[PDB]
Amino acid sequence: TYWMPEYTPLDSDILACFKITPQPGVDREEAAAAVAAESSTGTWTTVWTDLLTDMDYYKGRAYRIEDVPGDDAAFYAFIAYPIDLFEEGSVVNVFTSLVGNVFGFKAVRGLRLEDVRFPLAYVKTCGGPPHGIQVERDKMNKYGRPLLGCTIKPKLGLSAKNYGRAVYECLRGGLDFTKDDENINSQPFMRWRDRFLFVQDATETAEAQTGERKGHYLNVTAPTPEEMYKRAEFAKEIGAPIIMHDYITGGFTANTGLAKWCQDNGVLLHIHRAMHAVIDRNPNHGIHFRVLTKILRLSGGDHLHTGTVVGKLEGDRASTLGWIDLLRESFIPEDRSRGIFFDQDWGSMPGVFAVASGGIHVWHMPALVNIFGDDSVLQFGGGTLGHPWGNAAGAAANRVALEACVEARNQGRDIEKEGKEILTAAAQHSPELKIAMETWKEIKF
Amino acid sequence: EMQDYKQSLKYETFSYLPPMNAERIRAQIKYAIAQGWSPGIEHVEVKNSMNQYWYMWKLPFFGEQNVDNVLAEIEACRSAYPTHQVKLVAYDNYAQSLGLAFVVYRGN
Numbered sequence: 001t002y003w004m005p006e007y008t009p010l011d012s013d014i015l016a017c018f019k020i021t022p023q024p025g026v027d028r029e030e031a032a033a034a035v036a037a038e039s040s041t042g043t044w045t046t047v048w049t050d051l052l053t054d055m056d057y058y059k060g061r062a063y064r065i066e067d068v069p070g071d072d073a074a075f076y077a078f079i080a081y082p083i084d085l086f087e088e089g090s091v092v093n094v095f096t097s098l099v100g101n102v103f104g105f106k107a108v109r110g111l112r113l114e115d116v117r118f119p120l121a122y123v124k125t126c127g128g129p130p131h132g133i134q135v136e137r138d139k140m141n142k143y144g145r146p147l148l149g150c151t152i153k154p155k156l157g158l159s160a161k162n163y164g165r166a167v168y169e170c171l172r173g174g175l176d177f178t179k180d181d182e183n184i185n186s187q188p189f190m191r192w193r194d195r196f197l198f199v200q201d202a203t204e205t206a207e208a209q210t211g212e213r214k215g216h217y218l219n220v221t222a223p224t225p226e227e228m229y230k231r232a233e234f235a236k237e238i239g240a241p242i243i244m245h246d247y248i249t250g251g252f253t254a255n256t257g258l259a260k261w262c263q264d265n266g267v268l269l270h271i272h273r274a275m276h277a278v279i280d281r282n283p284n285h286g287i288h289f290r291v292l293t294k295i296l297r298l299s300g301g302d303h304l305h306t307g308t309v310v311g312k313l314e315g316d317r318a319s320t321l322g323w324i325d326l327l328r329e330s331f332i333p334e335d336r337s338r339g340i341f342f343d344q345d346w347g348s349m350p351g352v353f354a355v356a357s358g359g360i361h362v363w364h365m366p367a368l369v370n371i372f373g374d375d376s377v378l379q380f381g382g383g384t385l386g387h388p389w390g391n392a393a394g395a396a397a398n399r400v401a402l403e404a405c406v407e408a409r410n411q412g413r414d415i416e417k418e419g420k421e422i423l424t425a426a427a428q429h430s431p432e433l434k435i436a437m438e439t440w441k442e443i444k445f
Numbered sequence: 446e447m448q449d450y451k452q453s454l455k456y457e458t459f460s461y462l463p464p465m466n467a468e469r470i471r472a473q474i475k476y477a478i479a480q481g482w483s484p485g486i487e488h489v490e491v492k493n494s495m496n497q498y499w500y501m502w503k504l505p506f507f508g509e510q511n512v513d514n515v516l517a518e519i520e521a522c523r524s525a526y527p528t529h530q531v532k533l534v535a536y537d538n539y540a541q542s543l544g545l546a547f548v549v550y551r552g553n
Contacts, residue, residue: 133542134540134541134542137542137543138542141457141495141497142457142458143457143458143534143542143543143544143545143546144457144458144459144543144544144545144546144547145458172452173450174455174461209452209454210452210454210455211454211455211456211494211495212455212456212457213495374544388447389447389448389449389450390447390450392450392452393448393450396450396461399461400461400462403458403459403460403461403462404462406458406459407459407462407469407473410472410473410476410545411472411476412476426462429462429463430461431448432448432450
């Protein structure tokens with residue numbers, strides 16, 4: 001009753017693609033049907049109350065099975081769910097319905113949710129980004145390049161005032177943003193109200209001395225919603241332009257509320273993806289990051305960490321580029337090479353800045369600019385704070401490298417091919433960049 | 446051997462590079478045009494550089510394919526407002542954004 005190979009999905013249906021690794025011997029159509037049932041009705045055996053309902057309507061149906069290229073032990077199951085199975089404007093409900101129970105199904109060795117098609121009629125019920133890329137650029141007055149940020153380290157042990165000192169020195173050197181670590185909420189060594197006040201002083205001081213708008217992603221991730229909103233309110237009260245939330249660990253209910261609050265109060269929202277690798281790393285069991293990307297765009301954020309792309313080998317980058325498109329673009333066509341199983345239309349829902357972070361330094365700049373283009377935030381932690389002349393100098397080196405790569409790009413140069421030359425030429429006018437290049441040059445013995 | 450970082454006011458994109466000569470400015474105009482963006486010129490008093498709304502010089506140069514005419518207008522705007530900061534922008538109608546924006550003369 002759940003395997004319906006003649007079913008043509010409606011344009012309003014939510015669709016899911018599950019990669020199923022069945023127990024050897026289990027019939028593919030039976031497994032697909034079982035996953036459709038558990039993720040909609042939960043059961044195969046009819047009880048009398050079922051007969052009170054329109055059973056043909058209110059069920060998921062598996063409508064297509066495909067081989068997984070390269071993996072004979074698995075198959076893709078495509079399942080369609082009527083739009084009415086779900087609470088409107090609720091990523092929480094869609095997620096709970098799709099993934100609440102089925103991952104424990106004992107007749108499969110593993111289940112992986114690869115993609116979910118959110119129909120436009122459902123997308124229109126969700127708040128989405130508080131601002132999105134283009135509004136954020138207008139509010140911050142920043143055009144024509146990627147934005148630059150830095151996470152303050154160490155993550156532990158700094159007072160509010162010392163933390164603010166680090167923030168101030170980074171911002172004055174040319175970074176647009178600094179960032180709270182995901183684990184910085186309110187700790188004995190640095191209580192949140194003190195952090196917010198000293199960070200805002202740092203931000204204002206650096207802004208005055210550079211004449212460029214600055215911000216610092218103040219983490220409002222908190223034990224309860226009351227605390228989260230109190231911290232968000234205080235950021236607004238003191239004039240902070242941007243806050244941060246850990247959407248998976250704080251959770252989707254909290255995130256969606258906070259994003260609505262940010263939209264209502266003009267505050268930008270940076271989203272950290274802490275814990276994603278618990279869920280998204282195993283290729284045979286869990287939820288692919290591209291699904292978590294769609295969920296965040298609907299729940300809402302103005303920036304989202306996406307991975308750096310450059311940290312993977314050249315043949316392994318396509319999926320990352322796919323979810324970056326899902327995050328930023330209005331319409332993303334099906335493309336199996338990039339792991340996009342369904343066309344995804346966002347309509348007019350704005351895109352979200354892709355944030356590249358993790359182990360990057362000035363020598364990655366040409367590739368980062370080429371791969372991400374302008375609507376990205378490039379975060380440099382060790383690559384700013386580790387500059388031998390300190391944070392302002394570190395920031396300035398990254399800023400010069402970025403601007404030199406963008407200018408070269410705009411001139412029509414192949415900036416990856418000519419990256420060393422572009423950086424070297426810029427370093428002739430920037431002592432800070434010249435020594436940064438020395439600091440992070442890969443030494444080969 | 447540590448060198449102290451010298452603080453000064455900045456002016457957004459490209460302001461961490463040396464100021465552009467004619468050749469470098471022309472290359473940016475040609476880029477903007479190749480992207481289908483409409484060049485525009487703005488100016489403002491130095492103290493008001495952070496304003497969201499600068500004075501527009503004439504109107505945006507819609508359909509303009511001639512790089513030299515845009516550069517000539519930049520120079521003409523400078524002549525009209527010799528103490529002002531002068532910015533080149535390029536309007537992207539599909540994004541409702543600016544594809545490019547930078548300060549050509551930093552003001553005085």
